[PDB]
Every structure is written in structure tokens, then in C-alpha cells.
Design a protein around this ligand. Sequence first.
Ligand code: GTP
Ligand code: MG
Lengths: 71, 99, 82, 53, 53, 40, 31, 427
Amino acid sequence: VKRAEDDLLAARRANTSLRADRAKLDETISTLKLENDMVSRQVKGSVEAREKALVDHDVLALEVKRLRDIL
Amino acid sequence: KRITEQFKDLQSKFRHFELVDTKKYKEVWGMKEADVAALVRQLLQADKVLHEQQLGWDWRPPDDRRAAEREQEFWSRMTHVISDKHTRVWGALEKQLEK
Amino acid sequence: KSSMDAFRAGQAERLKQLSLASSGAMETLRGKLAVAENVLKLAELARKYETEQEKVLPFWNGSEVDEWDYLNCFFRRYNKAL
Amino acid sequence: NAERQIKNLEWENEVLSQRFSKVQTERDELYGKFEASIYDVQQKTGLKSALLE
Amino acid sequence: NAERQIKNLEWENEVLSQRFSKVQTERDELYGKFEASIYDVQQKTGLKSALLE
Amino acid sequence: VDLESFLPSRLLNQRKEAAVQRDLKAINDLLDTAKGTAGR
Amino acid sequence: IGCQQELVGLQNENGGLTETLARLRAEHTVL
Amino acid sequence: REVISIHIGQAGIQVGNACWELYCLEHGIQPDGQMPDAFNTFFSETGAGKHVPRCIFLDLEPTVVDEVRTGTYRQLFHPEQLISGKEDAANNFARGHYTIGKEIVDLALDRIRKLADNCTGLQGFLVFNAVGGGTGSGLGSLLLERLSVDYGKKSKLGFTVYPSPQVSTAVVEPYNSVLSTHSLLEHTDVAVMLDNEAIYDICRRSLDIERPTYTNLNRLIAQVISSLTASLRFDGALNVDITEFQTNLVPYPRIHFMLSSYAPIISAEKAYHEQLSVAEITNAAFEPASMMVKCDPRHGKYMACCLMYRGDVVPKDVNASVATIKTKRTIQFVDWCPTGFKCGINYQPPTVVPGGDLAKVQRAVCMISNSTAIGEIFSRLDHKFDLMYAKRAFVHWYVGEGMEEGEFSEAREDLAALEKDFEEVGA
Ligand SMILES: Nc1nc2c(ncn2[C@@H]2O[C@H](COP(=O)(O)OP(=O)(O)OP(=O)(O)O)[C@@H](O)[C@H]2O)c(=O)[nH]1
Ligand SMILES: [Mg+2]
């Protein structure tokens, strides 16, 4: 009887330890997911900025070529 | 009267924007396709020099919605003018010259 | 005004896609050209130590070419140096 | 329900893409090793031929 | 918007699935082809090497 | 023949790995679970 | 001896927790 | 230009206990933190003439952290950086890295990051630890890995203590050092190497003391650290910084384990009689007995040496002295580099600690050199670890605390690879 109850106490402490580990891991996982989605948003914004810069770039190149032709 | 004159101004602006945007897009495409043509000419010259000097033994030039497919075809052609064959040849040749 | 905005947006999008695709293609082509010019520079530097023998006969004493046997004359020159 | 499907598809696509990236890079390196070996053996054959001549 | 997202993500999922499978098959065939193919070029030069010998 | 005798060898023919192996093991386990769920 | 039954429940959930923690470790690596 | 200082374990924080005394003495800051530009690297200013260090002291056993919490320097530090665990790692790599290491690293890192944020321009981390025990080795390895993952590009300097070849305190420090090299090689960027027995013999020979406590070692290592960082703070003719160190003293990525030496490490009664001009202090910084590590440089070759001259130094006598060193025969540089020296000068003379053992010397020299004379140390540690690993001794502790076998297999093969790398870069 006492042997079974000691087994029960060991099981309880092991369960509590594993539950704490699971809680910590899942909280960290949620933080990682939030971080990942926000940095993906940032990367998309960077892509848009790069495209706009490229369009401005070839506009400027067009102007340069026209002035070169006039010269 | 305000909204009538605004309507007239809107029509004039519509015409002006149509002409300006079409002209600008056409001109920029023409300029940049001329640029890429110059670049591919340079690539062909480099390929000819490499073959005839190092290891060619023979070198041979190539031959030469709707707008979307046309442009895709054009870019695919001008990027596939030089083949994976030649790219691997150049890489292995570079290593061999190093050693 | 709706027609205005739709037309202008369409023009902006087509310019965007043209610029992006063209830039990618040019980057690939420039990479190829940089590899080629590095190759030429290595050849130029290497032929300095070559004697006039192999400066004037680097090859020896007609279908298309396969990649395996594609460098045989260069290996001949390499073997001469060895 | 559609939002849940979005989440699931996004996650599985991410993991599959990572596997693709790994396999692509190391297939590239294996191919490079194969090319180096074949060029080396052809060099050895050419050298043997030169000695024979 | 949810259904368009479902359709696009499903299409990308499937296409990357076939690409992953085919590159894995490329791996499998390359591993076997490695040893066998090297000797082939040796026999290609084998005729002239034997003639010189 | 003396030159032939010379040099016959040329005449004839980590932690990063462990970390990559760990990552690949984890992702392989995740794929195993993912297709298990997809099948069932 | 219902202590043993409740202990067995603890053991089953312990095994489930082990499996879940393995899942979460892999999840963290890929994330 | 600032550098952060983190001290892990008994040895590291004890060394820092003298390092910060030396720093306050240098910069004129009173112990409470008041002065009745040049300090910005080591201190941040606030209040009405108040300065606080850019350091963290973290340890598991609070017995020693209480000593600094109460001993005359309580007002100096920020009363949060003095981290304290709950119980010692007990010389156990697994207890310091896997069991308890996962609970204090969060509080340590979330403080390091905010100190870095406070820092104006980050320029380096410097970490004090001894690989002779669990609390140092395992936890420092974990934290160094975490920092490498987080920041990465920023320089890291591990001022690491190995155990002596025969004068050894712990019994499991061979195991611990072999299991800590797996990080000390791959994650830090410059390793400044120490050894207790070498300092024992140095202070027995020059500082004429036969029974030296840990105080002497800590003081004459704090002097080396101050001479290392003097170029960041003070003005000099040829100031040399951390990136200079990195680019000049690391020929190959996995060869960064450099010796150290200081001269004149002289008493207060020989200082007047014996003359300490540059042309002889430079020579006195090259004898094998003046190396702070119990190694014999005559058994190998010098790859690259770096000299720092604090005090009254003119840049021509350094040239003459280096010429004499090169023309000497008892030493032999690696044939790779003709220009094997990295000169550097400063203007602030060496700063004496009142009541200390060293003297008010007009000038001093700190030399740090990368050479192949450390493969012997690596080999001896590997041998004395393999012999105890043969019978499977002391391993059940690590097994029960988290290690299984792969840790030991990979550490053993990694150390073998490092020794072979030094052997092959030798000749
Ligand atoms: N230089 C110097 N080294 C010390 C001092 N105290 C201890 N050591 C070194 O530290 C080793 C053992 O101490 P540590 O392992 O660092 O003690 P710890 O930092 O509390 O780490 P654990 O022992 O694992 O708890 C010895 O081999 C010594 O070489 C010191 O005061 N000065
Ligand atoms: Mg301790």
C-alpha cells in the first residue's frame, strides 16, 4: 500500500514537472509565431519598397538617356 | 457650375494621363531592352573569345495577356541564350585554370 | 473617377511587373558576365608564365562537342606543364 | 473553419519548403563532386596518353 | 478571400510535393549512377589508350 | 622511363554536421507526424 | 486500491506528455 | 567605444573583484561611485557624479556573491546584476549546463541585452571563466552559445583559465575542460589563456614570494586586462583596438588560443636598482618563464605576437627591440609571416594599486602571442581525460544528470581534430 502511494507521489511530481516544461515550451512557441508573422510582414514591406525604388531607378535612367541623346 | 467645370477638367486629365502613361511605358521598355541586348552582345563576344582561344574548336552564333506572354518569351529567350552546358563549362574551366 | 483610378492602377501594376522581371533577368546576366570576365582574367594572368613554345602552340606538338570531352586540348596543355 | 485551414496549410507548406531547401543544396553539392571526379579521371587519361605518345 | 487563399495554398502545396518527390528520385538515381558512370568515360578513352599501348 | 617512374600517385587515380543532423532529425519527425495525421 | 487506478491515469497522461513534449521540441526547432 | 564584462563562476568573479578595484583606481572613481570621456568604455554615468560598471557577475552558489554584495563595493554595482542561483553546479557539466543551466540563463541574458542597449556603441564582450569546474565550464559554454546565436558579429574575448598540468585542484576538471572546449573553440572569437601554476612560478621568481594566495593571481591578471583595454580609453601614438587584435592575431578561423605576458612584474625593492628601459623590458617579456601559461614556447614556433606599451615609450626603441628579438636565435617565427609583430603604445603609465605587490613603474609591456606551443597543453589534457574515460569512471554522475555518450565521443574527436590542426599548421 505504501509502495503504491509512493509510486503515486512520484507520478504526481513527474506530471507537474512535465506540465511546467510543456507550459514553458508552448509559451515560447507562441512568442516565436508572433515574431515570425511580424517579420514576414516586415519582409513584405521591404519587398514593396525595393520595387518602388526599382521603378524610380529606371525612370531616372530614362531621363539620363534622353538628356544624353540631346547632348 | 463647380461640378460641371470639374467634369470637364476630369475628362481632359483622363486623356492626358492616358497618353503620358502609355508613352512612358513604351519608352522605358524600349530603352531597357536595348540595354539587355547590349549585355547579351557582350556575353556572346566573351563566349566566342573563350571558345576560340581556349578550347572551342568551333564557335557558332545563335539565330537572334498577349503583351505578358510576349515579354515572358523575350526574357526567357535572352536569359537562355547561354546554356547550362556553357555555364558548367565556364565553372570547371575556371577551377582548372586556377590549379 | 472610378475609370480614372482603374486605368492608372493598371498602368502602375504593369510597370511594376515589367521592372521587377527585367531587373531579375539583368542580375542573372550580369552574374554570368562576371564569371566569364573572371575566367578571362585568370587566363590572361596564367599565360604570363607560359613559354613561347606553348604561347604559340598551346594545343599540340567536326561535329558538335560533348561536355565530357569538352576540355581535352586544355588538359593536353596541363599535362605538358606537368 | 477557413481560418483554421489557412493556419494548417501555411504550417505544412513551411515545413515542406524547408525540406526542399535542404535537399536542393546538398543535391547541388553532390552533383559538383560528381563533376569534379569525372573531370579528374579524364585528366588522368589524357596524361597517360601524353606519356604514351 | 478565404477560399482564394485555400485554393492558392493547395496548388502550391501540391506542386512543391511533386517537385520534392522528383528531386528525391534524382538523388536516388544519382547515387547509383555515380560509380557506374565514371568507368564509362574510361572506356571511351579506353580504345585509343589500348591502341597506343 | 625515368620520368614515368617519377610520381605514380598523380599518374593513377564535426559540430556543424551534428547540428544539421539534429535539425534534419527533428524536421523528419515532424513530417512523419504530419503525414500520419494527413493519412488519418 | 483506487489509488492504483488514479496512478494508472497519471501514467497514461505522463506518456502522452512525453509524446507532446517531443512534438514541441521539433516545433521549436523548425520555427 | 565600450566593452561589456561578464564574470561567470568563482574564479571569474574573484578576478573581477580585483579588476574593478583596478579600474576605479585608474579612472579616479571612488568606491562609492563619485569623482571629487576616458571611463565611458567601462562605466556609465548618471546622478550627481555617479558611475556604474558595464558588468554582470553571475554564479550559482550565493556564498561568494554575498561577499561582493557586502564588501566595500556594494554601492559600486547595480544591485540586480549580482545574480545568484540556488546551489552550486558541483563541478558537474550536466548540472551546470542541462539541469540548473536552463533556469538562470534567461535572467542573465535579459540583463546582458539591456546593458547592451544602454551601451552607446558596442565593441566587444569579455567573459571571465575557468574550465576547471561545472559552474564555469558548462554555464559559460551555454551562455556563450546563446550570445553567439543572438548577436553573432560582435567580438567575444574569453579570458579562460585552464587547469595546470600537474597542480590540479578538482578531480573532474579534465572531463569538464574536454567538454567545455566544444564551445570555447567554436563560439568565442579570441581566447586569452591563463594557468594558475605559471603565475605561481612567476611570483615566486620575480615577485619573490613563496606562498602566494589567489589575491596575487587576481591582481596581476587584472593588470593584464587593464593593459589590454588601455588603448580603447586613453590616447596613444599607435592605438590598437579589439578589431585590430582579431584581424592581426587570428591567421585561421579555428586557431585562436593566445598566451600572455607582462613585464616588469617587479617588486618595490628591485625597482630602483634594476633598470626598466624599453630595450630590456621587451626582452624580459619574451623569456619562457614570463609566460602566464605553463607552456614552453621553445617546443614550437610563434605565429603572431602583439605588444602593448603603457607609459613613457618612444616609437623607435620599440623598433630597435623588435629588431633584436627577430635577430635572436633561441626563438623561431613561423616561416609564413615576415611581419610577425603588432606594435601598440599608450600614454597612461601603469596604475599601481595601493598596498599591492607591484610598484610605481614608469612603463610596462603586455604581450599576447599566438604560437604552436599549446598543442602540448591540448594533448596533455586529452591524455589525462582519455585515461580516466577508459574505465568508465566518474561518468555515472554525468549520465544521471543528462549526458549519455555522444557528448564525450564528439568532444574527444573534436580535441583530436584540433591537435591535428595545430600539428599540420606547424610545418
Ligand atoms: N586565477 C584564479 N583561479 C581560480 C581562483 N579560484 C579558483 N580558481 C580556479 O578555478 C578552478 C576551480 O574553481 P571553479 O571551477 O571556477 O569554481 P566555480 O567557479 O564555483 O565553478 P564550480 O567549481 O563548478 O562550482 C581551480 O582549478 C582554479 O584553477 C582564483 O581565485 N583565481
Ligand atoms: Mg562553485
